[PDB]
């Protein structure tokens, strides 16, 4: 099967700043992956991104009730859907599991299964944070509404100094600490 | 602070389409085109919200008719294939005889057609496997997750085999220990 | 609550 493929894409995007205080709306049409026509809440009308969408922008702007509908989309569509799922999306908090194990000139701190993805992980030498030789795997999205991240520490495991991994997450009112 | 995206697509000649909502990179729900049902990514979401799936079927039908129109405008220029980046990992640190899940992550690909198969010791495994629908991206390619819940053993060896038209031979990502 | 869909518009012919 080598016959050509043809893809149409439509993305109705809602962008929120400080919750529903500042909202931007984008009605975007795509041929394969190129945007050819777009309505921007800041612009107020459909505009052709490429000449491929030139016929649609002039046609859609002329339709009766179109602009009144699309210009109200921030209140009627973006702000509405925000509150429909605010309780289990914006307000979703899952506290994380923190696991510490060596793998040994490298000690690793594994933080798993938290939401949202905003997290801060530090490494304390003993009572002062080691800010050198620390590498992080970054924020990895598990795809099941949970996140995980791995911070490594290229330190010399010397018996008798305690090592503490400290994570900070919006799900907790106080930092979480785990000692080796 | 947050971004909610209603993402739709229709693909020819496969005659395949999907309709999903995305919140900060995660799926809220998608509409099963065959069953004409709303399918929530997390089962708990269905208790606090609802969605009339008939509106999605109407939107997919408009995208199908628009695709024929848009294909004419471009004088029948097809999509250019883009191969995927496949990554296999584990949502928890692996421990012997302690249940866990393997995550095959397919990223940065188009068109949204893939053959993904889990391989335990070179032999296909289909018991317990789950999969996500095609998820959008800012560059307007696609991404997808495949999950194989497994029990870690020192004997077993796992593989994720992905077939795409941007590749030649299948891409096979390994995992052991 | 009840989710809501921005409808798809028919392109000009």
């Amino acid at each position, epitope marked *: 099967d080598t016959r050509p493929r043809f893809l149409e894409q439509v993305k109705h995007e809602c962008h929120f700043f400080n919750g529903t205080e500042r909202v931007r709306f984008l009605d975007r049409y795509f041929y394969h992956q190129e945007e050819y026509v777009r309505f921007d809440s800041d612009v107020g009308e459909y505009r052709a991104v490429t000449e491929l969408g030139r016929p649609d922008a002039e*046609y859609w702007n*002329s*339709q*009766k*009730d*179109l602009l009144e*509908q699309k210009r*109200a989309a921030v*209140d*009627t569509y973006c702000r*509405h859907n925000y509150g429909v799922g605010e309780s289990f999306t914006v307000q979703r908090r899952v506290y994380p599991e923190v696991t510490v194990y060596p793998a040994h000139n490298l000690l690793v701190c594994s933080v798993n299964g938290f939401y949202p993805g905003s997290i801060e992980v530090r490494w304390f030498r003993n009572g002062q944070e080691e800010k050198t030789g620390v590498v992080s795997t970054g924020l990895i999205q598990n795809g099941d509404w949970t996140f995980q991240t791995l911070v490594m520490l290229e330190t010399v495991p010397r018996s008798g100094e305690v090592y503490t991994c400290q994570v900070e997450h919006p799900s907790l009112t106080s930092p979480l600490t785990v000692e080796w | 602070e947050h971004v909610i995206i209603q993402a739709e697509f229709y693909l020819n000649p496969d005659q395949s389409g999907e309709f999903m909502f995305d919140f900060d990179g995660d799926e809220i729900f998608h509409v099963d085109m065959a069953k004409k049902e709303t399918v929530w990514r997390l089962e708990e979401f269905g208790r606090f919200a609802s969605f*009339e799936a*008939q*509106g999605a079927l*109407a939107n997919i*039908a*408009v995208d199908k*008719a628009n695709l024929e129109i848009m294909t004419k405008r471009s004088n029948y220029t097809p999509i250019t294939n883009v191969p995927p980046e496949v990554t296999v990992l584990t949502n928890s640190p692996v421990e012997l005889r302690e249940p866990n899940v393997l995550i095959c992550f397919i990223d940065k690909f188009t068109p949204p057609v893939v053959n993904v198969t889990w391989l335990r010791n070179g032999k296909p495994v289909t018991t317990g496997v789950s999969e996500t629908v095609f998820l959008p991206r800012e560059d307007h390619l696609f991404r997808k997750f495949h999950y194989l819940p497994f029990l870690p053993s020192t004997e077993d060896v796992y593989d994720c085999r992905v077939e795409h038209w941007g590749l030649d031979e299948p891409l096979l990502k390994h995992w052991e220990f | 609550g*009840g*989710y*809501r*869909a*921005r*409808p*798809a*518009k*028919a392109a000009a012919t």
Partner: T-cell receptor
Amino acid sequence: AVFQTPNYHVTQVGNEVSFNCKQTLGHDTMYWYKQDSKKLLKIMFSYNNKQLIVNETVPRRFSPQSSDKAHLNLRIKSVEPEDSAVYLCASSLDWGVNTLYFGAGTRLSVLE
Amino acid sequence: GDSVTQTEGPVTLSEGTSLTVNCSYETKQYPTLFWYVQYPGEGPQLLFKVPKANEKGSNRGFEATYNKEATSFHLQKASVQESDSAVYYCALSPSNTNKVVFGTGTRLQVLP
């Protein structure tokens, strides 16, 4: 505007009747409504871009048709005396909540 | 399911009289409310619509308040003219899709 034909039509039970409607607003969605002497306004069919969305009518008696987004035609295979009413055509921007724009109406009289 | 109940029977007023067409609705979703007027010889026609819960609509001296707590959309005008003689329809539709439920229209006859 929304244009309907015919304006009036009288026929006998068991005959075939055909209604036609055109809207020039550029809208994607068109409707057929039945209005009776009691001034009750009930939907029969709704089309959005040549695809049927809503069907509230008796199964297998009617036959809507839409070759174009701006055209919506209705056909009654066999008219019963209860089909005597005013049939209104309407349009809306899309299938979402919108203003309905009606035509003048077709007055049908079905006689034994 | 979705229901709309408005004033029954013909209403006959002398010009200058205050009009009140009661409209009560019953819906499980969050709707937008409409008033439609049908002048003699024409089809129905949008008077005004209120999308959000506790706002007010107005047109041609008519006015109605979307009363979410009372589930009412009562139409009122302080001084009806002879040109207001028509049939008035109170309509409901959910905000997620266009499924418009009309009430039994109230015929208003304004006498000089």
